[PDB]
Amino acid sequence: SQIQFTRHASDVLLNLNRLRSRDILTDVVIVVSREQFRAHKTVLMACSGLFYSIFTDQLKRNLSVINLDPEINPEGFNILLDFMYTSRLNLREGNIMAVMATAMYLQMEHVVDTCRKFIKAS
Amino acid sequence: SQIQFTRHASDVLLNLNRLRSRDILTDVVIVVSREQFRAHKTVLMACSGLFYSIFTDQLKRNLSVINLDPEINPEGFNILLDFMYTSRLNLREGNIMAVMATAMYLQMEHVVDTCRKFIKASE
Amino acid sequence: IFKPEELRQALMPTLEALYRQDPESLPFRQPVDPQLLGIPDYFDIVKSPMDLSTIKRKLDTGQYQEPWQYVDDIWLMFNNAWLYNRKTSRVYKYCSKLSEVFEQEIDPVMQS
Amino acid sequence: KIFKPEELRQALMPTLEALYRQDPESLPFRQPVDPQLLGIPDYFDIVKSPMDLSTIKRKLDTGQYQEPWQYVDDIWLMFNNAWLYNRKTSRVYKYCSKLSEVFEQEIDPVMQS
């Protein structure tokens, strides 16, 4: 019955990326060691088990700043943040292990799974 | 040559709908005559020229409440809000004219265009 | 022989009396959506779903031949909820209260 | 003449690096123009041969320039794309003007040698 707009989801994602790129209505900064990343909490929650857990927790939901585990690699977070806003995952042999480790911590399981496929077919 | 996750965008949209449904991290109420609709401002901006303009305006970006034109039909808004969060547009002969009017006001042009196609093909 | 309109006139107030209960009817007014609600096991536990809206349709389309068939769907609906939801949960508690209300005013109607 | 990769790289790269050093002016120039992210879909209709600092840097480091005039052509293509595409009132056009000043100051010396 309802009409299906097959490009609508991509268009929303693109526009969300645009707002990120222009720092419009970002409501959190994610600190990964010394690096910092401005993002939208809802997009984070929508792509990550961990962010889902953090922002669902009432004692954290209204934080403006979230410090990740210091073990966490910034380049890895950054690749994944970009993935969250694009559907495009930049996997290279030089980054794969840091990307997967970061995905495992962020609870991005289909990413983690894709990483393992990349590793084994390497 | 990045890896392309073809279901990722829909998955994000679905999850955004889930948060809407549970009233998680909604930051605005859209008042359409007497009725009220909680939403996320970013999703609204992302789907609507008007909401884009409202929330990019510095004098309005931080408003928690937006009153639409009293002319605007609630059932029509609601159908479109649900479209924004689902990719699914519920067009019926009984609603089509109010849906299109609402889409024209919200500046959702591929919707408005689809509405015109629905009208013309209705026999 | 029960004609649609007879049952509809007899039974629809009992249905409408459930809807009138707020908030308790709210988990029950629409079919359970496992996807939106984020409970993917639902259709494994609950093999025959039922809700107020599906019952209302069946009345209005005169799909009940006898009142016991209406009463069966009402209990399927309540029983699905009691089965699926934890006893601590709000929707289970709402199920209990809603069931009270149904009993209160089906017993009269069923006598005729 | 015999211009070696390392020759050109050593001669020209300071001129490139001198552009990057300019801040904020180099910022619209450091990465290829992204029409989609930036929300300017006509870009690739106006600008049929894109160029930016990063693409030029690659070409140097990959020794894709045989002669310094080829490097200087890409730099001017880059500036010219910006002057073409951006309006004269706009910040990126104004940045283009400033950045081009700096390039001219840097390259005139180097091109004699």
Author numbering:
A (entry chain A): 7 to 128
B (entry chain C): 7 to 129
C (entry chain B): 1048 to 1159
D (entry chain D): 1047 to 1159
What does the study report here?
The paralogous lysine acetyltransferases (KATs) p300 (E1A-associated protein p300, encoded by EP300) and CBP (CREB-binding protein, encoded by CREBBP), are essential regulators of gene expression in healthy and malignant cells. p300 and CBP (hereafter: p300/CBP) bind and catalyze histone acetylation, interact with transcription factors (TFs), and activate transcription at promoters and enhancers. A catalytic KAT domain (86% identity between p300/CBP), an acetyl-lysine-binding bromodomain (97% identity), and several other conserved protein-interaction domains facilitate these functions. Here, we developed lysine acetyltransferase TCIPs (KAT-TCIPs) that redirect p300/CBP to BCL6. KAT-TCIPs recruit the acetyltransferases p300/CBP to the master transcriptional repressor BCL6 to activate cell death in DLBCL cells.
This KAT-TCIP features a 4-carbon alkyl linker and induces potent activation of the BCL6-target reporter gene and cell death with an IC50 comparable to TCIP3. The asymmetric unit, resolved to a minimum Bragg spacing of 2.1 Å, contained a BCL6BTB homodimer and two copies of a p300BD molecule, each tethered to BCL6 by MNN-02–155. Five residues engaged in fortuitous interactions constitute a p300-BCL6 neo-interface: p300L1082 contacts BCL6S27, while p300Q1083 contacts BCL6R24 and BCL6R20. The interactions are primarily hydrophobic in character. Thus, fortuitous amino acid side chain contact between p300Q1083 and BCL6BTB enhances complex formation, providing a biophysical explanation for potency and specificity. The computationally predicted linker length of MNN-02–155 (6.6 Å) deviated by less than 1 Å from the measured distance between p300BD and BCL6BTB in the co-crystal structure (6.1 Å), validating this approach. The crystal structure of a KAT-TCIP in complex with p300 and BCL6 exhibited potency enhancement by fortuitous amino acid contacts independent of plasticity at the protein-protein interface.
